[PDB]
């Protein structure tokens, strides 16, 4: 549709059961990312045509250094390399390229991931590939329901995640961060203590009032308002891993303003008020990066 | 004697395999196995749509101890085949979980680990998934000639009588595919390597395909009697890292599996399976899956 800016298909879908994230560095000349990105989004359209019931979406997104090159420095004014927070409590592993694929069918996501790798070829060095899965009752592996207060429905998710006007219209900022859960440590905590750590009840998933939970509770850290206006984000996080090996949450969020994500990280990691998130008692982040997801027509026009 | 629930279900969408060694007292496996099979029954009741099943199976040394040397006459440690071309990684314990729902399998695998606790040392945990059109990652449909329906699957996989009635022998072997090597082959050449056409999945006449084709290696008859097995194999891995097929088969006789391995790996006639051009096995083990009644009678 001329004069408009179409969002990449992976930002908005809700309740998808499976995802693949690929994070990679650029190995050679940045020009190689131009044709590869166009091939990949075309492949996504082909898979959507072949598998209409998968409800597939995907996003290509770029780190600061390569996006500044590809854009000539226009727009994406908030973009920067992911900093450390809490002096290293949240480590930084900023890469050049993020691919996020999500759908109702893991097997379709796998084919799409293979297509991404064929498009980019040896221009990229893959740093990790994570297969996310929705767990029972949409719970995080800790046993708490994850997603309840996420923006709901296309209209509100667009408001929160999608830039509305100007050169970046239809684009979004992305944050990804892989957490490694220590479930043995979690299971040493009583359920009441776990509920004070999160800020919601475990079985029934009821919010515990802000004046009845510690300021270190996760909800107290991240449910932030500025003069009454919530700093909302669109989360796409999923569980990942093996039962006997590494497992946790692959955190992913989209926002039209990087600012909202950063304020939540400054809060969680001790930089705002000297207190940190209680979830650090059982889980820790081991990666972190910021990316810019251009509109689809900005990709299709790379050249 | 009732069969363990994971042998017979067809067309699973996802599986988890856990291979482990015994670190503690062999007697710890008795109570743990009973706990786990009860967990599986509870999960089936909670998730009836999942069509969940699971199997606990034991390596030769531990099974001889748990059984007092009675039955399981064919059981032995997995040897190398082809003098080492197929490696051997025999462990003490196999747990196989399968269903329509990966997330249910994950909860079941956590329950297995809780039941066995620190008596076991996990050596491998593999998450299988059914790919598009039930194809192996090579692009060839996998499973077409597998026994179909409970009647025939019981005939092939489940021991009929005696002390082992309701049990089965299990073989597991992880393969690592090199899809770059595969993709350098023309499609006609790939078809002659497998023995079936790629898109349409039609058998190529045995008289017109190479004797090294996969089907010529594994579709074996003895005076016209097919040496059938029940395969539960699935794709696994990451797109950018290691990926392949996790091969898994059940049979009432270990013999049928072993004859296929001797054929594939050059021991029978000096010829090897043509798929070794692009994929290779990296683990291998044999296990005995007792009936449920036998498990209940352990401790
Ligand atoms: C180990 C990692 C994490 C776990 C297990 C986790 C878990 C949860 C849970 C259980 C909830 C409550 C239900 C819900 O409304 O979704 C929640 C809410 C939320 N989380 Fe997290 N989370 C993690 C990391 C993060 C990070 C890193 C951020 C932000 C940078 C974040 C932002 C949010 C937000 C904004 C909410 C909604 C709060 C509200 O408005 O009520 N989470 N999370
Ligand atoms: C890389 C590993 C393997 C791959 C990709 C593979 C793939 C295939 C394919 C594409 C077929 C044809 C369709 C079908 O009927 O299922 C097939 C058939 C079969 N495979 Fe394999 N296979 C592998 C390993 C093995 C092993 C290790 C064995 C036995 C020990 C085996 C036994 C069989 C049998 C019995 C059949 C049916 C043959 C017939 O009666 O037509 N396969 N396999
Ligand atoms: O709130 N973590 O998706
Ligand atoms: O024939 N391999 O499942
Ligand atoms: Mg709130
Ligand atoms: Mg035949």
Residue numbers in the entry:
A (entry chain B): -2 to 300
B (entry chain A): 2 to 300
Paper text:
The enzyme investigated in this work originates from the human pathogen Klebsiella pneumoniae and belongs to class B. All structures exhibit a dimeric ferredoxin-like fold typical for dye-decolorizing peroxidases, composed of antiparallel β-sheets with four β-strands connected by α-helices. In all DyPs, the prosthetic group (i.e. heme b) is coordinated by a proximal histidine (His-215), which is hydrogen-bonded with a fully conserved aspartate (Asp-268). The fully conserved distal aspartate is responsible for deprotonation of H2O2, whereas arginine 232 is important for maintaining the distal heme cavity architecture and might support heterolysis of the O–O bond by transiently and electrostatically interacting with the negatively charged distal oxygen atom.
Exchange of Asp-143 by alanine does not change the active-site architecture. However, in D143A, the distal access channel is significantly bigger, whereas the surface exposure of propionate p6 remains similar to the WT protein. In the structures of D143A, a molecule of unknown origin (refined as nitrite) was repeatedly found ligated to the heme iron at a distance of 2 Å. However, the presence of this ligand had no impact on the conformation of the distal residues. However, in D143A, the small effect (+20 mV) seems to reflect the increase in exposure of the heme iron to solvent compared with WT KpDyP. The variant D143A is unique in showing an alkaline transition (pKa = 8.6) to a HS hydroxo state. In the absence of Asp-143, the apparent bimolecular rate constant of Compound I formation is reduced by 3 orders of magnitude at pH 7.0, and the pH independence disappears. In the KpDyP variant D143A, the rate of Compound I formation increases with increasing pH, suggesting the assistance of hydroxide ions in H2O2 deprotonation. In addition, the restricted accessibility via the small distal access channel might contribute to the observed poor reaction rates. This is supported by the fact that in D143A Compound I, the reduction rate of thiocyanate was significantly enhanced due to both higher reactivity and unhampered access, as indicated by the crystal structure of D143A. In any case, during turnover of D143A, Compound II accumulated, suggesting that Compound I reduction rates are significantly higher than Compound II reduction rates (k5 > k6) in this variant.
